[PDB]
Design an enzyme around this catalytic site. Structure first.
Site, PDB file in Angstrom:
ATOM      1  N   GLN A 189      -6.116  -9.401   2.531  1.00 15.45           N
ATOM      2  CA  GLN A 189      -7.290  -7.481   2.725  1.00 15.45           C
ATOM      3  C   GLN A 189      -7.631  -7.128   1.081  1.00 15.45           C
ATOM      4  O   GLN A 189      -6.498  -7.297   0.391  1.00 15.45           O
ATOM      5  CB  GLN A 189      -5.946  -6.778   3.258  1.00 15.45           C
ATOM      6  CG  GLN A 189      -6.775  -6.038   4.246  1.00 15.45           C
ATOM      7  CD  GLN A 189      -6.514  -6.503   5.722  1.00 15.45           C
ATOM      8  OE1 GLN A 189      -6.886  -7.299   6.034  1.00 15.45           O
ATOM      9  NE2 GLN A 189      -6.637  -5.700   6.179  1.00 15.45           N
ATOM     10  N   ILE A 190      -8.579  -6.157   0.850  1.00 12.88           N
ATOM     11  CA  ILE A 190      -8.580  -6.224  -0.396  1.00 12.88           C
ATOM     12  C   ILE A 190      -8.490  -4.868  -0.173  1.00 12.88           C
ATOM     13  O   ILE A 190      -8.879  -4.172   0.043  1.00 12.88           O
ATOM     14  CB  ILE A 190      -9.707  -6.286  -1.472  1.00 12.88           C
ATOM     15  CG1 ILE A 190     -10.666  -6.592  -0.394  1.00 12.88           C
ATOM     16  CG2 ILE A 190     -10.204  -7.933  -1.238  1.00 12.88           C
ATOM     17  CD1 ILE A 190     -12.884  -6.361  -1.028  1.00 12.88           C
ATOM     18  N   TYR A 191      -8.072  -4.108  -2.046  1.00 11.29           N
ATOM     19  CA  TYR A 191      -7.755  -3.003  -1.972  1.00 11.29           C
ATOM     20  C   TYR A 191      -8.176  -2.616  -3.793  1.00 11.29           C
ATOM     21  O   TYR A 191      -8.337  -3.147  -4.980  1.00 11.29           O
ATOM     22  CB  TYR A 191      -6.018  -2.520  -2.017  1.00 11.29           C
ATOM     23  CG  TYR A 191      -6.061  -3.139  -0.726  1.00 11.29           C
ATOM     24  CD1 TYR A 191      -6.409  -1.903   0.413  1.00 11.29           C
ATOM     25  CD2 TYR A 191      -4.812  -3.552  -0.103  1.00 11.29           C
ATOM     26  CE1 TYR A 191      -6.065  -2.160   1.759  1.00 11.29           C
ATOM     27  CE2 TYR A 191      -4.575  -4.400   0.988  1.00 11.29           C
ATOM     28  CZ  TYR A 191      -5.811  -3.550   2.352  1.00 11.29           C
ATOM     29  OH  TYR A 191      -4.613  -3.496   3.134  1.00 11.29           O
ATOM     30  N   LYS A 205       0.657  -1.259  -0.076  1.00 13.37           N
ATOM     31  CA  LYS A 205       0.083  -0.195   0.085  1.00 13.37           C
ATOM     32  C   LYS A 205       0.799   1.340  -0.357  1.00 13.37           C
ATOM     33  O   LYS A 205       1.899   1.564   1.510  1.00 13.37           O
ATOM     34  CB  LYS A 205      -1.192   0.178   1.730  1.00 13.37           C
ATOM     35  CG  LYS A 205      -2.125  -0.493   1.076  1.00 13.37           C
ATOM     36  CD  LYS A 205      -3.161  -0.679   2.425  1.00 13.37           C
ATOM     37  CE  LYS A 205      -3.704   0.558   1.729  1.00 13.37           C
ATOM     38  NZ  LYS A 205      -3.584   2.258   2.943  1.00 13.37           N
TER      39      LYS A 205
END
EC number: 1.5.1.3
Lengths: 60, 60, 60, 60
Positions: A49-51, A14
């Site tokens: 986790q998704i982004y 990220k």
């Protein structure tokens, strides 16, 4: 894919805010997030986790 | 896919425990969850949650 | 609390982007999110999501 | 608290399945999870995940 920014297995992180880093293991698409990725943490195996693509950068 | 239990756009729900219901919008695969799906809530547009295939059922 | 923006049981919703709406059931605090809340969806019982206070509004 | 299994700042980890490890930074309570905790990852600062008390162990 004939277009996706990243592929399965790419290593990414990220770019800002809460941290996240690991490998691409999936993908998703909604009106709000037309290009999204599922990322499995390299520090916490099994946790995904998704982004949206914009939040992510390949490393590199 | 030549195999996946569900396809994009299928309507599904979580079979038990916390509730979730909406459309399939993505997929993921890890050692722990070799067949996983991203599901966008039909009640809360834009909100997506991911689950292993076993937790989900098509509706139906 | 002698200060918190919301209390247990308040009904709130996310102001923009992905939707979320339900009752306050918890709280959290980190350097990045010094005032955060856990909210249980009123449409999907048992499902909880957490957000920073700024993303939320009481309803109202 | 006059009862909670853990307190703010305790170091804990998920006992099995997907991994997670870090510090307790919050708490939540629902019918499904009457005693839940928010845990900030010690490897990915800013990232928080929530779990029921039974999934967690203090380290120790």
């Amino acid at each position: 894919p004939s277009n996706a920014t990243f592929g399965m297995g790419d290593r990414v992180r990220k770019k800002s805010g809460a941290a996240w880093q690991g490998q691409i293991v999936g993908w998703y698409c909604t009106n709000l997030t037309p290009e999204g990725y599922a990322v499995e943490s390299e520090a916490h195996p099994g946790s995904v986790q998704i982004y949206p693509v914009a939040a992510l950068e390949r490393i590199n």
